[model samples]
Target: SMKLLFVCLGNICRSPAAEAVMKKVIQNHHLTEKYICDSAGTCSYHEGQQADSRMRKVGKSRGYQVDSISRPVVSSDFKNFDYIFAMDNDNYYELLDRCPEQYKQKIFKMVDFCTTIKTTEVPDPYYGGEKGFHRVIDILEDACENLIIKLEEGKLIN
Candidate 1:
């Protein structure tokens, strides 16, 4: 089984959405048992909280599930996860700064897996409107789908 972690500034928005989207993809393909998905933040501002209400609402309308508590990334995660996806460059660099050289290879930008969008980062929607939240889902859905395909081709997931 493979363990994957999604990260953002605050876990309440983007990272949780990615975790949910990826889980849905895993479940849809009957690969749930082969993948362990999780999400975290670079900061602990919203730690222990559920995903942003707007994010969950938008995702629910689209048949995606945003069910995860906000938490900051810990050192153990570097060793536990096969892949650590950062939503934006700030958090990506933050992860890199805190990561040991040996584990840095597992880190990547979430948008890198996205085939449809030209984006380099998944923007934060905490202060934005409902449309922003919906857009996050759009990007996440695309990225997660392609990520699954890539992992499948690599036989990373059972």
Candidate 2:
């Protein structure tokens, strides 16, 4: 099995949305048994809490269900996950800083897998309104779609 972990400042918004989007894509591709997907935060501020209500609502509207609790990224995650995707530069650096040398190569920006959008970071919609959440889902769907394709072609993991 291959493990993928998504990270952001807090697990309540972007990361969880990415997790849900990836899971839906994996299911759509009929590769659920081959992947283990999860999301986490750089901090523990919202630990144990569910994804932001707005994110859940928007994701559900798009047929992506996000049923996950927030948790902070741990040292063990660097070793356990095959890929660790950061939502933005801040979290990307944080992950790099905390990652052990041997596992540092697994970290990447979530948008790097995106083939459509000209974006490098998955923007945070925490302080914005509903439209922001909608945009996030759009970006995540595009990136997750390409991610599944890579996995199917054996380009992501062997």
Candidate 3:
């Protein structure tokens, strides 16, 4: 199975939301046995915590689950996941900076998978209002959908 790790600054918001959206899409396609989706943070500030209550509400309202346990990125991730998606430029660079030199090519911008968005980053929503969360979800959902298509075409789901 393909192992995907979605990442953001903290595990509380964007990353968890992305994970939920991707998981639901996988379930809808009945591909759970062929793919694994997860989320993590680039930092440890919120480590060991559940997603923010507001994130949980937003995801749950959309019939998605945001139950991921927050964990900081590890040096070993380069060897574990098939793909590592970063939510924004800041986190992308953070992850890119720490990735082993030989494994840097495995990291990607979550928005990069989105054919229509045209943007390269998913702006941070922690300091914004509710609308921001919805926007991130929209972008992430689109990206995840496209990613699923590509994976299927390539028979990457093992």
Candidate 4:
């Protein structure tokens, strides 16, 4: 399987949502066994916690489950996952700081796969209100599709 790690600051907001969305998308595409989706935090602030209520509500209402457990990024992740994607620039830089030079190629911005949103980052919604979280999901859903396509074209997926 092609292991994919989605990351955000707290692992409660964006990353978890992306995790669920990616799972749903892959399942829908019948690629579940070909891709393993997971999420983590750049920091340990929300380690061992569940995803945020707001993010859960957004995903659940849309038919996706935001049930990923929150966890902090670990050095072992670089060796475990095929693609380690950061939710935004901040998380990208933070992951880079923790990852070894050889694993740097595995780290990338989630928005890097976006086909429509020409932006380079996925905004953090920790401090923002509901609108922010909703926007993040919108970005994630789009990016997830793009990510799946990219992975397939690159033969990372069966």
C-alpha root-mean-square deviation, each candidate: 2.1, 1.4, 2.3, 2.1
- Model 2: lDDT of residue 129: 97
What's the lDDT for residue 126 in model 2? Answer: 90
What C-alpha lDDT do the candidate models reach, one value each? Answer: 0.91, 0.90, 0.86, 0.86
Per-residue CA lDDT of model 1 for 6-117, tens digit only, reads 9999899899999989899999999988998999999998999999889889989989878899999999999999999999999999999999999998998999998988
Q: Please identify model 4 stretches exceeding 4 Å from their true place.
A: 155-158
Model 2, 51-135: lDDT tens digits are 9999999989988888989999988999989988999999999999999998888888888888888887899899999999998
In Å, residue 17's CA in model 4 sits off its true spot by 0.5
Question: How far does residue 156 in candidate 2 sit from its true spot (Å)?
Answer: 4.0
Error of 2 at 36 (Å): 1.3
Residue 108 C-alpha lDDT in model 3: 83
Kindly indicate the candidate among 2 and 3 with the higher TM-score: 2
lDDT of 3 by residue, 4-97 (tens): 8999998889999999899988998899999898889998999999998877887788778889889998988888998889998998899988
Q: How far out, in Å, is residue 103 in model 2? A: 0.4
